[PDB]
Amino acid sequence: IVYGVIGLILIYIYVSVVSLLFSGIDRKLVARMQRRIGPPILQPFYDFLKLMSKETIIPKTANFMFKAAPILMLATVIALLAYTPLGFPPIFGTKGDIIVFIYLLTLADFFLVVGVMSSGSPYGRIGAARGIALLVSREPAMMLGVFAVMWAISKLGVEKPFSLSSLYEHTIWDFGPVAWVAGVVLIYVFMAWLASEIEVGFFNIPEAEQEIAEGTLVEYSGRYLGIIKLAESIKEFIAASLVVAVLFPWQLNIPGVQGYLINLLLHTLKVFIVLLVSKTIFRTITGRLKISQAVNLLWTRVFTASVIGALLLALGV
């Protein structure tokens, strides 16, 4: 049990170093794509410190949740790190532990919306009802794909079914010729979910657009803003780690007490290659859409393809 605390502290310090550095490389590439020098590489490690520097402002009409939601957001991200596949099988992975993952990946955004909406002026009230419509609209699209693949990798035999430690035993890519089509339909629905969860591209709706550019987080000002800008970057790393876990886990065997860190580096490199397409290219190449058009796209051209992929992969076994 005490050997499960050392991992939860050390992997947290590792991920909190790496994620901001990936964000800095991303801003440099986006700046070079349109004829610019761009900021230096470790630029977020200055913005974080100056946001912790300043004077926090509390409005006169504010609850006890204004000062306590940017604690619970970071808390349910740090507590989510212990269940994620970092390349080796996770620490607390038992027979359940998929619904705990889906529940805690849903619950952080609800803490964010409750923290924004629990203030005064009604810019936050309009910038929150736009948030939860997009939250409800993007999570029947991943449940079907992940439940279909977790059910289908349990036919050929495993001892911890419906668990993320079971996803290193056997993958999709050895079910025969018909699975090669479900592979690309599932690459489609997972890239669409990964772009719509970290909210960049078409789906840059509730962040820097409250009627022009006000945003959802128009109100948090001091320490609280620094904590929220850290927590969203850790969640950026977590969701892409899930996407590279389901799609193609191809790690080395390499027994010993140092094959763990080699597999950890190889997983970090695959995370970088998956972000590089989605976030960078899809941010540079396409603007916003709308909210009434961002809802009828995730129920028509994403959720439909999940049903096609799940049904076609069910007709392979």
């Binding site: 502290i9 947290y12 912790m52 520097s53 300043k54 004077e55 926090t56 402002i57 509390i58 409005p59 006169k60 009409t61 604690i71 970071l74 808390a75 740090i78 203030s119 005064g120 002026s121 009604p122 810019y123 128009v218 109100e219 001091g222 320490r223 620094g226 904590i227």
Partner: peptide
């Protein structure tokens, strides 16, 4: 851990205050 971080960052840096207009239009 998340409360220890505010306990550190309240010491270094200035305090707080209470204004009200919402910074909203």
């Amino acid at each position: 851990l998340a409360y220890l971080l505010n306990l550190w960052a309240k010491k270094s840096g200035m305090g707080t205050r209470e204004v009200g207009e919402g910074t909203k239009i």
